[PDB]
Amino acid sequence: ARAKAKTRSSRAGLQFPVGRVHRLLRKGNYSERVGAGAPVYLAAVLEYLTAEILELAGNAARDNKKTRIIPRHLQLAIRNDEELNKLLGRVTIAQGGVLPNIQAVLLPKK
Amino acid sequence: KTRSSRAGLQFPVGRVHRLLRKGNYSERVGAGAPVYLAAVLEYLTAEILELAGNAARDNKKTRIIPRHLQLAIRNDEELNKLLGRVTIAQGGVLPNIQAVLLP
Amino acid sequence: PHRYRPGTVALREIRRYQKSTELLIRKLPFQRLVREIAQDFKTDLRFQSSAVMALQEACEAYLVGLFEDTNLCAIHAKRVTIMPKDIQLARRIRGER
Amino acid sequence: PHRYRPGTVALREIRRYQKSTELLIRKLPFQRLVREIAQDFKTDLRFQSSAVMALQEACEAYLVGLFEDTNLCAIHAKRVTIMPKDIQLARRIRGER
Amino acid sequence: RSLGSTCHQCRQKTIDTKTNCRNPDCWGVRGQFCGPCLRNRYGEEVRDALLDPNWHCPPCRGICNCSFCRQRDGRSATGVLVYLAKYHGFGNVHAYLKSLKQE
Amino acid sequence: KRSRKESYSVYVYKVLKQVHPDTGISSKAMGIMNSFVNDIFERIAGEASRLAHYNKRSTITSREIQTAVRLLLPGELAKHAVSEGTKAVTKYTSA
Amino acid sequence: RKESYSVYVYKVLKQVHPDTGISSKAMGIMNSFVNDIFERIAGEASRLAHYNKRSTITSREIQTAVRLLLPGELAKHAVSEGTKAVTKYTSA
Amino acid sequence: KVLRDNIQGITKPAIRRLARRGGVKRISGLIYEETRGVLKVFLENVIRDAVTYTEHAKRKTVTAMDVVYALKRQGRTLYGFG
Amino acid sequence: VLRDNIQGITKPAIRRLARRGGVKRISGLIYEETRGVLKVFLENVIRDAVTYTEHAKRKTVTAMDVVYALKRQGRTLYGFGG
DNA sequence: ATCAGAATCCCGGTCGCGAGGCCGCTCAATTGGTCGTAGACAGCTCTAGCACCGCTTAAACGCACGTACGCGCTGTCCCCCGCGTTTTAACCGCCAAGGGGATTACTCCCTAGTCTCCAGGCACGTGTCAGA
DNA sequence: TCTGACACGTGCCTGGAGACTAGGGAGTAATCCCCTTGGCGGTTAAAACGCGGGGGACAGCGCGTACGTGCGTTTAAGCGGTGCTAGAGCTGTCTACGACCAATTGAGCGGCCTCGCGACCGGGATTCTGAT
Ligand SMILES: [Zn+2]
Ligand SMILES: [Zn+2]
Ligand SMILES: [Zn+2]
């Protein structure tokens, strides 16, 4: 009867595409064959990391009372979380600026 | 009749082709790709070996040990830059003392 | 006349430019520099606007990070002004020869 | 009796140990430390001898490089002795902090 | 961001009652105006506009001076004109605008 | 005559509506999260390929993905990310 | 069983130094160096093959990878020592 | 078409602004030439790699992706233009 | 069980490592800082070595696992089968 | 410490370009079946970690002593910062060409792929010689 | 003198080489348009100079802390044996799993268009320093 097709991401309960990730793995010449539980794991991991960065960036924008994330709200969302900072420690972000940080030695005396 | 003889190299070419195919770098590997790769590997190894042998000769020694290799890499600028983040077992370090340290 | 004590506008500028995000080098001089440098390697080259913008963004990020390291080296030596020796020490420790 | 001025034996061992190439930490204490550290990751592990030897070589190389950078930091601040702040500065600039 | 109505003249999001266009031929949201804009532009209020059965949106009568509609007429942007009308004794800019055309 | 190219903007946006229902994202920031996804994907896939090659295996499986996530991601992330992926995989088992 | 670059590096050493031998530990170090450089160049050539939408690794990919990794005089030399082999293969 | 003496276009106020973003408060008068040299070296490396990629692509134009790959090869991954 | 073995990295051993590094005078508080630094580095390498070993369902940490763990951190080590 | 220049939010007016959605295709993900082999499980074997025991005996370790050098204090020039003036090239909005990145249509020849055979490295086994 | 680590000798497979093939990757012509290259005029903001002077770099000095050097005591690292067994390698069987392949159908990409957000100014607090 060939019941109505459902995307493998739906079976995995995801939002990132498991099928596209499978195709990218197979065509990206990483190994001769790839399993059925590799794309699911990788897509879930990418979805989770994106979810955390978006969680932090939305708050970073809200404290700036803005209703549209810009690159700045990513940098403030990245260099403030120690683990996310460690994961992306060798990455530059275009139009991201930098955290405000003045050394205590330079601050005015008295 | 081996592939190295046709290209005139002492490094393998068939083995390099097998390692290119079995290492899934690409779906297809061209004819001259293993030849070029083997020639470049042979050149780099020859340069390293020449420098290490000169260092051993200046050391009054017959066999090349890791110390000689470390000296050869750490003295040649280009080879040092190519191997800037590599540690050599029992390779030691270049003897150097800062000027202010001296009496 | 009102005259700020030396160093006040330095902290004011520090706050103002650490708050912002725009590029600090003017676009035309950097475009000229990029073209001048790239003309050596290949001739009659062409650059996408995105290429020049990406190069400028990378250069500003690198220089800002280097200046943070230089400032740390300056503060280490019981100083407030960054000198060339601080830049040299930061570049030597970072491994940038 | 004969007594070397302070710092003479310092340079003597400096030259002696940059001339040499062997491991400078005792084998048994380092092996015990490696086993104790690895005890917290997987219970009842076993180590090939070459594994512990490789760990010792890597650790000694790392510490020697760190001490080189620390000496550079100490010289920058117009000093001869190395203090913890120099190690901290070297590790911060290297990206380890 | 998903609840507030947007005025046609000011084109911002705010929580306020806005008038409606009763023209059967009227289409879109362009029949909605906020009090601060219409009271400053034409001297009309929210209450009277709501209560009038034959009240039409300023675009319906052709007296809309919104920048979008002003550009659709092929003529420039008004900007801020309230104080200019006040200095000239005009209660609303529409009378000021009509007087400007007459002059 | 289209040059249509794939991009995760359909998902990067759609997962943003599940975590911040009333917050947008600029097209200059969509092209940054796109690169973040395309970078982490490559990192984990390359590590999985290396792990598969070390053990003389030819099949990349969820064990290599799990070990790669454990190797790259630091701290609680590696403790949390894995707990996500496993769930998905086990859900996939139930179909 | 296990394979290595021992025979080939020994041949190269005898060519460049007729009267110099090599130690087993240093021989393993040379094996590791050859493997590392081969991995680096092959991976970079794979990356260029992927970037330009090409399914074949050719001499051009290896040449450009050599130009990308090897610094300064090491690059221009190695390229000249690489193509010289390939053209020889053309002559057969 | 040719150009000459453009590294002086990296002005003293621009370098001072870049230092201000870096958090420095006082600037020695000798760091401007140092920063110009450092920037020139960094640009030389990245542009050389980018033009190498462009040449391998058989293209007469340099695109953003060539620059991004050139930066990634130096461990300076850039987000926003890829 | 094993404990306090970090004290087994004796003060003269740290002295020898520093002398090989090229330092001539050492402050008295350097030793504890060096012990902490070495412990952190050792933990970082050993974690990945044990991860590599566990991925292969082995109870023995081979030299090649340590080589891979060191390579992961950009500290490639030659001469141990790499 | 209080008052006044000076810089800066702040909250009313507008406006303007981009960002959410929305509709139409089209390209690729999904379904299903078949088939080959890659990895899993079970025995067997030999290796090589691991635990102990003694025994030297270099290396670590406490204390003593002296002095090198880190560190706080003064001076003292002097170099960089802040501000006013002038001037000059970046920026913005236009037009104007055309060079080349991009995309089809061949079509040709380069390279997996199979089979067969064979000689180049590998391991076991000594033997002269570096050199510790 | 003696230590053995390294130099070959020789079976021996077992990976590499030679012929032949067919199919798909990739040069090549043949546009096409788009998005890089220029001129060109204002103009305004932003770089460049000049000048006063104040805070900071840099050298000097002195006292005291803390480290290097040496010596006698101790103690466990290192070496050499000796069993013992956990477990790493290796092989054999065969089964579950992933690749390859023909429909086919919907998810996502391009264009569109309008709605809401993120900007500009323009007067009034609101801090923010500086000197008294
Ligand atoms: Zn309104
Ligand atoms: Zn209406
Ligand atoms: Zn209107």
Author numbering:
A (entry chain C): 10 to 119
B (entry chain G): 15 to 117
C (entry chain E), D (entry chain A): 38 to 134
E (entry chain K): 264 to 366
F (entry chain D): 27 to 121
G (entry chain H): 30 to 121
H (entry chain F): 20 to 101
I (entry chain B): 21 to 102
Task: Copy the relevant paper text.
To address this question by biochemical and structural approaches, we generated the recombinant HMZF domain of human CDCA7 (hCDCA7264–371 C339S). Formation of the nucleosome-hCDCA7264–371 C339S complex was readily detected by EMSA for mononucleosomes where the structural model predicted successful binding (Nuc-58W; Nuc-58C). 3D classification generated a cryo-EM map of 3.0-Å resolution for the NCP, and local refinement and local classification generated a ~4.0-Å resolution map for the extra cryo-EM density located at the hemimethylated CpG, which aligns well with the AF2-predicted structure of the HMZF domain of hCDCA7264–371. This higher-resolution structure confirms that CDCA7 contacts the hemimethylated CpG at the major groove without eliciting any drastic distortions of the nucleosomal DNA. The R274 side chain forms a van der Waals interaction with the methyl group of the 5mC (-58W), while it also establishes a Hoogsteen-like pairing with the adjacent guanine (G; -57W) of the CpG dyad. R274 thus confers preferential binding of CDCA7 to a hemimethylated versus unmethylated CpG. Meanwhile, the side chain of Q275 is located within hydrogen bond distance of the cytosine (C; 57C) and guanine (G; 58C) of the unmethylated CpG dyad on the complementary strand.
Although DDM1 can remodel the nucleosome on its own, we have previously demonstrated that HELLS alone is inactive and must bind CDCA7 to form the CDCA7-HELLS ICF–related nucleosome remodeling complex (CHIRRC), which exerts DNA-dependent ATPase and nucleosome remodeling activities. We propose that the CDCA7-HELLS nucleosome remodeling complex assists the maintenance of DNA methylation on chromatin by sensing hemimethylated CpG that is otherwise inaccessible to UHRF1 and DNMT1.
